Write a protein that binds this ligand. Structure first.
Ligand code: ADP
Ligand code: ADP
Ligand code: ADP
Ligand code: ADP
Ligand code: ADP
Ligand code: CA
Ligand code: CA
Ligand code: CA
Ligand code: CA
Ligand code: CA
Lengths: 366, 366, 366, 366, 366
């Protein structure tokens, strides 16, 4: 059976092809003690690093979809195979995912490690947004995938990709977490360490939502306290936040909040559709597929619907497809693809990798 | 029963002899994907290529009545027989049409394919303008046939053709479509791809008309906006065009608009009549038969009547016969001819083709 | 009842003996298509060939009174009997006409066809000028007969012919038509085909006249435009001719216009009278009978009167008898002769033709 | 010194009387730009129009020997006098040529322009075929002259013309060029513009020849490729033609190829001889003089010899005189005539033109 | 003296007629601060915006030769007149340039601003490719002009334009810059902002070149590192690029690299020549004039020579004229045209603009 591993930037989602859900879901973190021991492992990975984060410095080996710490990335892959899935990687073909427009050396180094360190029989690196379309049972649609590191738009029509219309934005969940940490200082809450960043991320996932109209929401938050909610910190301290709940996700629609010049995800989606041929835009307007953890904010589909409707012609039918399980769409789509009989010719086996070299990994790479 | 196939340049009109209308009418196009697939046929034909034209490069295998891509032409014939008509071509004699003054090798290669690839029992290649006269129930008249590729005049008197008076002009619907694409840039509309050319062709068939007096119409279009009409593009964008509605068909009467030196269709019709014997001109003046899709513009018969009246002597009765179904006149006339008991000796059977060789196809070829 | 057929050269005049006018009058032409058919008889005869002459090559089987195309001559005789008169030639004796001084084989071959192809019971070949004298109710006079092919003078006195004084001139209507075609090129009108020759012949019969004094008429035509008349061609073009109206018939009086050395019809008439005995010249001078279509020009009798008066002695009374129906005088005279009880012994029956052979047809043949 | 100008239809041949060759030989064309200028004369004449024909519409002011555009004809005469010959026309008597049986107004208008626009001291309009006999040093012969516009036969015996035997045919070089353009479409070559007609004319003059036996030549051309020759177009494209080489000149012997009813030049020559007196036919048979550019095809004299021999009695000696310089025979003969001391009384001076008016130009006009 | 302003899309080139080089050359950009000030102009233009681009959002008011932001376009014109040239526009006639086949309203709005905002005495809008031919001292040639926004081919012969052969392609320098930004992500370099786009444009102008054979160059770049070059970013970071140097300009010859269906500039040039009359193609083949900044790549003339030679017949002489100063050819040609005494009648004065209205600006507009 095939292994499907979706290591985006924040989470590792790994399982077996054919299943409906990933077997192992844990943070893609490596923690090392920042104090000296007196009574003791060298490093902690995943959920283990998350439970001991008080005495650890947490590091993400993937930043903006690009693996920057390869020794830590091997630790995470090692724990995924042997501790979480408890398999021998030399017996299972492995389907990996990647964001589009990544550096070529990222996929090449990832292939060299899977074949020479873990000795997988075959492997394949798919594009994350394409797998999200498999999960929704569609052949046409523009996929907006947004995780912890990268947000990207990929339009697909009748099974054909339009690579020239692919848009990538280095604004995602991790940038929203850092922005929430910044604006939480307005209320006197100081989160600075890598362990406290994990607390702010949990605050973001519990309390943050997308306002349908940002300016009307800011007036409501300034008028009363009906939007304020409380959150209990791990030490028992209770914090209360008001407009920070919707100001943090608003960065997705106004990237200037964090000093970025790019347009929001609604205009990026619209600009990607407008780069496509005029005859396919109507189908793309009706098949906006949202994918990834950063699309899980309450009210984001209604806001995207409202924003794209204002940009598109009035006669087009704008339809945002936001399935409830869209946080696992990339993994579910990879589970479907790795189980197709037509896909079994697309595997890059260990034999044809020793012949063609690293150049073989860049097929269907846009 | 006999098959009647009228593949002019833009459309394939195929059916069975004896019927009143062609069974299959679809564009004579072959589309191939101009992007790479990621989720997938090699080529698309006819209406199938028209519905997926957003991701295709569309090619017409016939240009100016001459088959230039023979592999694509066989794809279209194959889909016509097996997918549209759903017959076995080895059981039906096939009547094909052709423009006059075509290259000899075009009809010879078309005959070799029908006998060796499709194994038809017999076949015949008629001239398109002669069939249009059959459709109108006449034996005398000058036929002005104009499709997507070629416009030609053929005078016939009492069942006798006058080949020396036959005139052919490589200005037809496709050249008008390209000219409309050019003058649509005056209003900021940019249609460049082969898929957008199909959109402009649909604009031409909906909104374009022939002005009775071109200079008075240009003054009216410059005075107000009573001539402007709107058209909704497939993506919801609404375009508005004014004098482009009648400037595009005016190229038929002023070929210098597209840089051609030839005279318009009115002078070509008059010059063809004046090459005929003086004793038959009166009957030709009263039997101007218009045929083909490019004669379907509103107001073209009144304009032709006005232009030829100004050229002919004042005592002649100019009568333009423009039947409402003249877009199918060639097919309808071919359906009548293929059902005549007198025509059953004119078939070129497979046996007499293996004996006389390709030379036998050039009988009654003018 | 007897059939009277007067086939001179240009027209077939056929009817029944006893009538006052020929039943069938049509051109002695056979037309064959000079183009190929595409939608169709092999040949057309008479008025049928005249109405379709635009696509035909017209041929006269009789040239200068001599039948040159015998297969076409049989077609004309066949259509005369079965289509125009609608009779069985095997039930009616047939009176035929002929110009004097014709080749002997012309009458012999004409007799063989009437007896072996049409199986007439009896036949007779009369001289055309003698029949014209029957029509005028005279026994004395010099007949000037002129049709399309031949002009001849035959003097008759008290019922006796003077064969040594018979004069024949191969200048008639067809030569005048060809001369009018030639001089019409002076005004830029080009008639060349056999169909256009029929148009010029119609122009000749409508507009041409004989000038009383040719040189005074040429000065009047060069002084103003009072002699110019217009004629509308079949295609609506209007032509205007001036002195060509009287220059064409002037060839009858000046045969040098067409390069002939002979004298005009006035001198030929005078020379024929002067070859007769001196005692009969006075009666011949007073009985100049004009006959045939070429004597139908306005002013020809006054011109003949003036010209012969200048040649004859001043004491002679010159009288030109030009009856209004002189175009049918030969047929009318043949109708009178074939109805005489004294003539019923002159028939050459089928029985006495099988005995004496072709030699019997040359009785009373001068 | 006298000027000799031979402007037939296609070429202007002008020079001085007494020379052996015309000084200026250039096409009788006027070209006007059919596009608009952006960086520029109004019109171009002769060789200048021929070198810029890519952006010009070329017009021949003479059609079928008849001047149809008088303003353009004056441009050509103006450039002939001032640019090509570089003379003052008011100092030189001008000998002009003309085809027989031309409209009277053509010579009258040509005389009015030479006397009132160019103020020539004297002028004379000769017949082209008569000058060709001067060039060959003969007094007896039938001249077959054929240029670009008109073909005509003029028999002359002992210095006397026989005008009644003069035959004129509006089939010449320009009609052969148009027929070659038509049959070149059989091989897929499309020449339509007036500039491309000049290319086809150059093809005709290089590759076309007269087949001795047309049917045997058609079998040879269909059997192999020994008759095929190549021609490089101005843009570098190479075309190959086979039987079109001899099918184009065959129209001279079979005018039905272009839909004309007339007989070929061999039968027209024979019919012209048979209209002459029987005593001069033997000398005409032995003195068939060919003249003009359209008689320059290789093998035309041998074909004419063969065709007329088959028509003439077997005891006659048929001799075709085709001198190598017969393309300039009309000009050379005009140079000889204008240098004769006996001809100096035949000039029509400016004084006697103001007295007699336009009527004086029609002397010795047949 | 006249002002010559060549504002294509990327650069403003302005000066005085009669000079050899433009006085002011600066980017056609308007920059506005994307952060808030704390210590400050509203907008920056040209070189001023380029030096402060770190804190600005840069906008080009011209996109694909079409002015889309008219308020910013007036800022650029204002700074050109008053800050760069330091003149009063009400004292100098202004020659402006434009790409062919532009929207009509672009030139009309540009004329209204020059006459009502700047009050120029007269103005004229020339076509850019026509001016390039003036700069090279030619009257015949096909000009390939390519700037930042648009690439167009204009064939001219003997001073006459062939508008029907004019081809326009919305692929130029800005599209190559965006494609280089895309393929630079393959090496891990992320340029996204409008300020970083200016850095990539500088990289393109320094290191990019046209490969003579693209596939052989891709093999050389994959074999070693002899093609790799380094570039120091403004912050001191050094980037190294290999095959991106020639893959970026290759888009000009393979527009499918950026998802465009059109053919490359070599086939577009060839197709434009093949739409011209056959008699002018030889001169166009020998006079391919390259113009604009996008033709400044090393090796582009040798590649164009090689590509067109493979398309043209082997006997044609292909000559690419790429002068070293061709980046200013449009301005230099406009300086020559505005100094011609023949051009002084072509100015559109303020008086005749108030009379004829905006319709007067479309003269010589193709
Ligand atoms: N309910 C939620 N609301 C808002 N953000 C969420 C939610 N759940 C997860 N996220 C964010 O999604 C990001 C991870 O996205 P995901 O696509 O699941 O993994 P990866 O980033 O590894 O591809 C994290 O930054 C996390 O904060
Ligand atoms: N209503 C219409 N008005 C104007 N043009 C039309 C109309 N309908 C069809 N056409 C044109 O006629 C052309 C096709 O003509 P037709 O004779 O039907 O087929 P073909 O060209 O294959 O012979 C096309 O170019 C199309 O744009
Ligand atoms: N009104 C007329 N004026 C002059 N010529 C006429 C007239 N009517 C007939 N003709 C000529 O007479 C000729 C025929 O003469 P006719 O004697 O009737 O017949 P045929 O020649 O057969 O004997 C024709 O050439 C015709 O052109
Ligand atoms: N070598 C040749 N072979 C065939 N045709 C020729 C040749 N040279 C000239 N011609 C034709 O002769 C015609 C011109 O004939 P010419 O008598 O010289 O001039 P014009 O027609 O003006 O009297 C042209 O149509 C030309 O095509
Ligand atoms: N040396 C060079 N190599 C490649 N491209 C260049 C070079 N110099 C300028 N360019 C490009 O040319 C474009 C501008 O072209 P130009 O014709 O000078 O101005 P405009 O586009 O305003 O007409 C810019 O996109 C620039 O990147
Ligand atoms: Ca993800
Ligand atoms: Ca058609
Ligand atoms: Ca008669
Ligand atoms: Ca000549
Ligand atoms: Ca430029």
């Amino acid at each position: 059976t095939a292994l499907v591993c979706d290591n985006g930037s924040g989470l590792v989602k790994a399982g077996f092809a054919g299943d409906d859900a990933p077997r192992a879901v844990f943070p893609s973190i490596v923690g090392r003690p920042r104090h000296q021991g007196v009574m003791q492992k060298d490093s902690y990975v995943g959920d283990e690093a998350q439970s001991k984060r008080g005495i650890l410095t947490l590091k993400y080996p993937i930043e903006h979809g690009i693996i920057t710490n390869w020794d830590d990335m091997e630790k995470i892959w090692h724990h995924t195979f042997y501790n979480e899935l408890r398999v021998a990687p030399e017996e299972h073909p492995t389907l990996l995912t990647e964001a589009p427009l990544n550096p070529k050396a990222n996929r090449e180094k990832m292939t060299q490690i899977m074949f020479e360190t873990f000795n997988v029989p075959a492997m394949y690196v798919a594009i994350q947004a394409v797998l999200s379309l498999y999960a929704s049972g569609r052949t046409t649609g523009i996929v907006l995938d947004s995780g912890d590191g990268v947000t990207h738009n990929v339009p697909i029509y009748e099974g054909y990709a339009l690579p020239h219309a692919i848009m990538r934005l280095d604004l995602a969940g991790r940038d929203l977490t850092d922005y929430l940490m910044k604006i939480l200082t307005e209320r006197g809450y100081s989160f600075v360490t890598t362990a406290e960043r994990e607390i702010v991320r949990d605050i973001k996932e519990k309390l943050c939502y997308v306002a349908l109209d940002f300016e009307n929401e800011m007036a409501t938050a300034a008028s009363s306290s009906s939007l304020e909610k409380s959150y209990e910190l791990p030490d028992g301290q209770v914090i209360t936040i008001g407009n920070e709940r919707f100001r943090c996700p608003e960065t997705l629609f106004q990237p200037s909040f964090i000093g970025m010049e790019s347009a929001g995800i609604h205009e990026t989606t619209y600009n990607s559709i407008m780069k496509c041929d005029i005859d396919i835009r109507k189908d793309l307007y009706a098949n906006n597929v949202m994918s990834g953890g950063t699309t899980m904010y309450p009210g984001i589909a209604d806001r995207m619907q409202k924003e794209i409707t204002a940009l598109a012609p009035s006669t087009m039918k704008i339809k945002i497809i936001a399935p409830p399980e869209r946080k696992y769409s990339v993994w579910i789509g990879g589970s479907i693809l790795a189980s197709l009989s037509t896909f079994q010719q697309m595997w890059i086996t260990k034999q044809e990798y020793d012949e063609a070299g690293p150049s073989i990994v860049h097929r269907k790479c846009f």
